[model samples]
Target: REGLIKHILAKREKEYVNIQTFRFFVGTWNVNGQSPDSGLEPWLNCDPNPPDIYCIGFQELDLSTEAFFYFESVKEQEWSMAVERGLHSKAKYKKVQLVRLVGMMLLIFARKDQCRYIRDIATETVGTGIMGKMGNKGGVAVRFVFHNTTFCIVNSHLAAHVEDFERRNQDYKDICARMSFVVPNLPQLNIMKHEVVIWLGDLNYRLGMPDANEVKSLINKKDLQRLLKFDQLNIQRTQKKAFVDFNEGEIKFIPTYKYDSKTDRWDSSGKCRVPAWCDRILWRGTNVNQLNYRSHMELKTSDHKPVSALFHIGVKVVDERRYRKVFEDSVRIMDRMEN
Candidate 1:
């Protein structure tokens, strides 16, 4: 009997378990304090196949002084409605949670049917701007469990400018190390502890090339692949300086920052900001497959083009009854072999 039980347990452990796949769409943009008006369709990408969940992040939603001083929920509500409209009436998606730190916001939505399986939802905020305590620059993360898989979506706005490489790296570390979700009945939850973590934001990391003219030349030449060699984020990841474990898909799209708002042209202002890929989306997890990664050039509400990614996330589902029956059959087979 003891041997049979041990055999059953071992077989159960090695047996194949049922798994389910879900589609997730993630989008990030630095709105530069602009309200959501239009051009969300390409970013959401609901043409032929809709997603099971939507994760959206924005930076500089409101740069006014009133934003930090007051409990400004109006802008947040407006953006939420914009996302709902993007989903369209053909299918319904309910807001799972929304987290915001001043100008930075992270919103997550799930299909109505998937909401029941999403539990233990929590959120955390970390401010790394203005002496590392102000909300002007920070991260807002939404953490939850879907079925047996744990997921964390973090939307962050790091230190800005082309020369702030060190500061940007520091911001990444601070957000990862300090941000924690406090659950009263459970131990503190950290973002990295989850099985699936998606980091999207206006990271503000820039290209190493100093000349704006040369960057523009490269953009026209369609030499983005070569230009990526100087990307600050790429350098940091390669040197294990920051975001060492995160994975970002190949950036085939043009740089996403320093565009002229309301037009498709690059920045023509006196500042002449050297165009860079400041806006980005990255993920770190197991059983997560990235399907598409690209930028939405048509949405010109902000200086930064909106970046989006699609993923197929795998979740484990256990069947206790099936496992029990399989275990019993395995035990019987073992007994016959011994006989």
Candidate 2:
């Protein structure tokens, strides 16, 4: 019928749009309650062209119960200064937003010129730690509209320890279910509703191999493919236990967790924790192209090395005036057909 034609044409016109590419630099680290004195240049990759957007997430920034009492203003300021120091004079960036949940923090920075194109900034936090309401372990998310494209980033500090995979899965599901942002007059929105969703943090998923000896042997041999077969996160993904809809770049680097603080050696304490790729970045969405994924082994501030990812995110441009005119034209055409 003519009515159906008008509806289909209107829908098609609304969905069709030109996309522009935006460069993004993303990184995640488990700082182990350390300060940001080590510098963030290597993680920022400022020498090469600076990205249009930067997303940084930190886990275990402060492990003490005092973090719950304090406002974390000092810690946030320190980290913000470090970020600016890394970008010093090289590029213009403004902190769009910073969301924190106790030890977990997520900071988003946008190019000063491009910040105007970004709007509708919102944030949400979910706790899955002790008592299911504590911020000791949880996620902080920021949602925004970039050039009319919806994007969201979630930074989480999941359950720790190698054997707490089940707990971590539960944490992931709880965060996904509970974390939501409210628009002024619209219903609550979840991460999955966004056009692009990125999840990054110390996920705490460890290797299945119990023997540290074998793990080290494989690492020394540079045979990461063999070791990846026992990776807990990979197993969970293969079995759909967690992150079933997300995609991660291939892992060619060494495990990011269990390193001795300020040293290259694995855990030397009696615990002898098995090395694992606990720090990771995963994404689920359309029009996003991943450029590279790797770990920064040079940073020794914490037991976990920082992992970075580069992406080219496509953002659709919306011309409201043109869209409205097209809709009106469609309605007029439909009226003529009906008459």
* Prediction-by-prediction clash tally: 0, 0
Expressed as tens digits, the lDDT of each residue in 170-268 for candidate 2 is 999999999889974688998899899999999989899899999988998999999999998899999999997999999899998888899888889
Clashing pairs in 2: none
- Model 2 shows how many backbone clashes? 0
lDDT of 1: 0.85
lDDT of candidate 1 at residue 82, scale 0 to 100: 80
Q: At residue 306, what lDDT does model 2 achieve? A: 92
Model 1 / residue 115 / CA error / Å: 1.0
In order of appearance, the predictions have TM-scores of: 0.89, 0.90
Off by over 4 Å in 1: 1-16, 88-90, 320-339
Candidate 2 structure, TM-score to reference: 0.90
